[PDB]
């Protein structure tokens, strides 16, 4: 019936501290086709099958990034450095699959409804940092111009294990976190 | 196939801080390529200041900030011809390039039926791993569709091009079936309990 293909790109910077970010990606319905790693000029497909079916010239994104960054400086000026209030994320933590003790699974941490799109996710098992095999998404857009982001932790369910996902949003006082434990 | 991109137009120039500027180039497809709409949105911070819609053929200011830019871009007929062409060289080209693995992407649901409780008060039908997100999950008691005591979560995005949903039946010779219809399946899945 209905489909949306989006090319979504953004260019942002902070002062105090000074930092810049950029993102260039293509999306289909709610899901990401690819993003370009702007430092390396590489198209990164969300699923490896996409990269076998299709191609994208990542140099094109780098040309867009130069235009994006110039646009940013012109719109900062045209707006007299007007700024918006930050919106802190809502977190959900849920497994990919039916939980069976000792069957490998994936915990998904979904940070939603935040702005600006600068947030880091940290995983913990029984209060200790776990990072092996973790995948973090790039920032996905919303109709309300807020963002969302996915993180994935491979795990093996066991009785009495607790997991936590903590998100550090740019400029927040500290992390917000959610816990999960199996059935 | 080699995917195409869309250029951004450039607006005219007229302690801690944060600035954001972005652009979204959207292709809306109804009955595939039969009806195609190109929309390009320009955003500053948390507000859209302007867009181009291929059905309109011109830039429209969405805020006072974009008013100058819409008129500046609207005064350039070659610039407007360029945007109107995006419907073909961006939207139609890209649809042909990715339809096989997006519109035609098909991933079968896995269906699990569990007791929840301490005595049984609820049956959970967990349906995981599917694409596209459109799905019908129904509970039957002795071949009769239940609705009254049925509670469904929204279909949840896993973010990896798969979706899941949970359908709980409140209930106390009884034969309960969770029936799942999905575009990936030639035949519905009947998970008995």
Short mmCIF file of N, CA and C in Angstrom, two decimals, chain A residues 46-115:
data_model
loop_
_atom_site.label_atom_id
_atom_site.label_comp_id
_atom_site.label_asym_id
_atom_site.label_seq_id
_atom_site.Cartn_x
_atom_site.Cartn_y
_atom_site.Cartn_z
N UNK A 46 23.16 -1.69 7.01
CA UNK A 46 22.62 -2.14 8.32
C UNK A 46 22.68 -3.67 8.40
N UNK A 47 22.30 -4.34 7.31
CA UNK A 47 22.37 -5.81 7.17
C UNK A 47 23.30 -6.12 6.00
N UNK A 48 24.21 -7.11 6.14
CA UNK A 48 25.15 -7.44 5.07
C UNK A 48 24.47 -7.82 3.76
N UNK A 49 23.28 -8.43 3.80
CA UNK A 49 22.54 -8.76 2.54
C UNK A 49 22.30 -7.49 1.69
N UNK A 50 22.05 -6.31 2.30
CA UNK A 50 21.77 -5.06 1.53
C UNK A 50 22.97 -4.71 0.61
N UNK A 51 24.17 -4.88 1.14
CA UNK A 51 25.48 -4.59 0.50
C UNK A 51 25.78 -5.53 -0.65
N UNK A 52 25.14 -6.69 -0.69
CA UNK A 52 25.25 -7.65 -1.82
C UNK A 52 24.23 -7.28 -2.89
N UNK A 53 23.05 -6.77 -2.52
CA UNK A 53 21.97 -6.41 -3.46
C UNK A 53 22.26 -5.04 -4.10
N UNK A 54 22.82 -4.09 -3.36
CA UNK A 54 22.89 -2.70 -3.85
C UNK A 54 24.22 -2.04 -3.45
N UNK A 55 24.46 -0.83 -3.97
CA UNK A 55 25.68 -0.05 -3.67
C UNK A 55 25.31 1.42 -3.57
N UNK A 56 26.16 2.17 -2.91
CA UNK A 56 26.03 3.63 -2.80
C UNK A 56 27.44 4.22 -2.79
N UNK A 57 27.65 5.25 -3.59
CA UNK A 57 28.95 5.99 -3.64
C UNK A 57 29.04 6.96 -2.45
N UNK A 58 29.79 6.59 -1.42
CA UNK A 58 29.89 7.32 -0.14
C UNK A 58 30.55 8.69 -0.37
N UNK A 59 31.34 8.85 -1.43
CA UNK A 59 31.98 10.20 -1.69
C UNK A 59 30.88 11.28 -1.82
N UNK A 60 29.73 10.94 -2.42
CA UNK A 60 28.55 11.82 -2.52
C UNK A 60 28.12 12.37 -1.17
N UNK A 61 28.08 11.54 -0.12
CA UNK A 61 27.74 11.96 1.26
C UNK A 61 28.74 13.00 1.75
N UNK A 62 30.04 12.80 1.48
CA UNK A 62 31.09 13.75 1.96
C UNK A 62 30.85 15.12 1.30
N UNK A 63 30.47 15.17 0.02
CA UNK A 63 30.12 16.44 -0.67
C UNK A 63 28.93 17.07 0.07
N UNK A 64 27.90 16.29 0.39
CA UNK A 64 26.73 16.78 1.16
C UNK A 64 27.18 17.30 2.51
N UNK A 65 28.19 16.70 3.15
CA UNK A 65 28.62 17.10 4.52
C UNK A 65 29.22 18.50 4.48
N UNK A 66 30.03 18.82 3.47
CA UNK A 66 30.60 20.18 3.32
C UNK A 66 29.44 21.18 3.20
N UNK A 67 28.42 20.88 2.40
CA UNK A 67 27.24 21.77 2.19
C UNK A 67 26.48 21.89 3.51
N UNK A 68 26.20 20.76 4.17
CA UNK A 68 25.58 20.67 5.51
C UNK A 68 26.25 21.56 6.52
N UNK A 69 27.57 21.48 6.63
CA UNK A 69 28.30 22.26 7.65
C UNK A 69 28.20 23.76 7.33
N UNK A 70 28.21 24.12 6.05
CA UNK A 70 28.13 25.56 5.66
C UNK A 70 26.70 26.03 5.98
N UNK A 71 25.69 25.26 5.56
CA UNK A 71 24.27 25.52 5.88
C UNK A 71 24.17 25.77 7.38
N UNK A 72 24.82 24.94 8.20
CA UNK A 72 24.70 25.05 9.67
C UNK A 72 25.16 26.46 10.08
N UNK A 73 26.32 26.90 9.62
CA UNK A 73 26.87 28.23 10.04
C UNK A 73 25.93 29.36 9.57
N UNK A 74 25.37 29.27 8.37
CA UNK A 74 24.45 30.30 7.81
C UNK A 74 23.15 30.32 8.63
N UNK A 75 22.59 29.16 8.96
CA UNK A 75 21.34 29.14 9.75
C UNK A 75 21.57 29.54 11.21
N UNK A 76 22.73 29.25 11.81
CA UNK A 76 23.08 29.77 13.17
C UNK A 76 23.00 31.32 13.12
N UNK A 77 23.55 31.93 12.08
CA UNK A 77 23.60 33.41 11.93
C UNK A 77 22.19 33.97 11.68
N UNK A 78 21.50 33.47 10.66
CA UNK A 78 20.14 33.91 10.26
C UNK A 78 19.22 33.84 11.48
N UNK A 79 19.48 32.94 12.44
CA UNK A 79 18.64 32.71 13.63
C UNK A 79 19.15 33.52 14.83
N UNK A 80 20.21 34.32 14.69
CA UNK A 80 20.88 35.01 15.84
C UNK A 80 21.18 34.02 16.97
N UNK A 81 21.78 32.87 16.64
CA UNK A 81 22.24 31.86 17.63
C UNK A 81 21.09 31.44 18.55
N UNK A 82 19.89 31.33 18.02
CA UNK A 82 18.77 30.79 18.82
C UNK A 82 19.00 29.29 19.04
N UNK A 83 18.59 28.85 20.22
CA UNK A 83 18.87 27.52 20.78
C UNK A 83 17.55 26.98 21.30
N UNK A 84 17.45 25.66 21.39
CA UNK A 84 16.27 24.97 21.95
C UNK A 84 16.67 24.24 23.22
N UNK A 85 15.71 24.05 24.12
CA UNK A 85 15.85 23.22 25.33
C UNK A 85 16.10 21.76 24.88
N UNK A 86 16.96 21.07 25.60
CA UNK A 86 17.26 19.62 25.42
C UNK A 86 16.04 18.82 25.87
N UNK A 87 15.82 17.65 25.28
CA UNK A 87 14.80 16.67 25.76
C UNK A 87 15.51 15.36 26.12
N UNK A 88 15.41 14.91 27.37
CA UNK A 88 16.15 13.72 27.85
C UNK A 88 15.41 12.46 27.38
N UNK A 89 16.14 11.36 27.14
CA UNK A 89 15.54 10.14 26.61
C UNK A 89 14.67 9.34 27.58
N UNK A 90 13.67 8.66 27.02
CA UNK A 90 12.97 7.51 27.63
C UNK A 90 13.68 6.22 27.19
N UNK A 91 13.87 5.29 28.12
CA UNK A 91 14.57 4.01 27.87
C UNK A 91 13.59 2.86 27.98
N UNK A 92 13.67 1.91 27.06
CA UNK A 92 13.06 0.56 27.18
C UNK A 92 14.14 -0.52 26.98
N UNK A 93 14.03 -1.63 27.70
CA UNK A 93 14.98 -2.76 27.67
C UNK A 93 14.18 -4.04 27.50
N UNK A 94 14.39 -4.79 26.43
CA UNK A 94 13.58 -6.00 26.14
C UNK A 94 14.42 -6.96 25.33
N UNK A 95 14.17 -8.28 25.47
CA UNK A 95 14.88 -9.28 24.68
C UNK A 95 14.35 -9.35 23.25
N UNK A 96 15.22 -9.71 22.31
CA UNK A 96 14.86 -9.96 20.90
C UNK A 96 13.93 -11.17 20.83
N UNK A 97 14.22 -12.22 21.59
CA UNK A 97 13.54 -13.53 21.40
C UNK A 97 13.00 -14.03 22.74
N UNK A 98 12.15 -15.05 22.65
CA UNK A 98 11.64 -15.85 23.78
C UNK A 98 12.83 -16.21 24.67
N UNK A 99 12.74 -15.92 25.97
CA UNK A 99 13.83 -16.26 26.93
C UNK A 99 13.71 -17.74 27.35
N UNK A 100 14.77 -18.51 27.10
CA UNK A 100 15.05 -19.85 27.67
C UNK A 100 16.41 -19.78 28.37
N UNK A 101 16.47 -20.16 29.66
CA UNK A 101 17.74 -20.33 30.41
C UNK A 101 18.72 -21.11 29.52
N UNK A 102 19.90 -20.54 29.29
CA UNK A 102 21.08 -21.15 28.60
C UNK A 102 20.97 -21.06 27.07
N UNK A 103 19.92 -20.45 26.50
CA UNK A 103 19.80 -20.27 25.03
C UNK A 103 20.29 -18.87 24.66
N UNK A 104 21.38 -18.71 23.87
CA UNK A 104 21.86 -17.38 23.50
C UNK A 104 20.70 -16.48 23.00
N UNK A 105 20.72 -15.21 23.38
CA UNK A 105 19.65 -14.24 23.04
C UNK A 105 20.32 -12.87 22.86
N UNK A 106 19.51 -11.84 22.68
CA UNK A 106 19.98 -10.45 22.52
C UNK A 106 19.07 -9.55 23.37
N UNK A 107 19.67 -8.72 24.22
CA UNK A 107 18.95 -7.64 24.93
C UNK A 107 19.02 -6.36 24.08
N UNK A 108 17.88 -5.72 23.92
CA UNK A 108 17.76 -4.47 23.15
C UNK A 108 17.49 -3.37 24.14
N UNK A 109 18.29 -2.33 24.04
CA UNK A 109 18.08 -1.09 24.75
C UNK A 109 17.68 -0.04 23.72
N UNK A 110 16.50 0.53 23.89
CA UNK A 110 15.91 1.54 22.97
C UNK A 110 15.78 2.85 23.73
N UNK A 111 16.61 3.83 23.39
CA UNK A 111 16.49 5.21 23.90
C UNK A 111 15.64 6.00 22.90
N UNK A 112 14.61 6.68 23.39
CA UNK A 112 13.61 7.32 22.50
C UNK A 112 13.30 8.75 22.96
N UNK A 113 12.85 9.57 22.03
CA UNK A 113 12.30 10.93 22.30
C UNK A 113 13.36 11.83 22.93
N UNK A 114 14.53 11.96 22.30
CA UNK A 114 15.56 12.85 22.87
C UNK A 114 16.10 13.75 21.76
N UNK A 115 16.72 14.82 22.24
CA UNK A 115 17.28 15.87 21.39
C UNK A 115 18.24 16.66 22.26
#
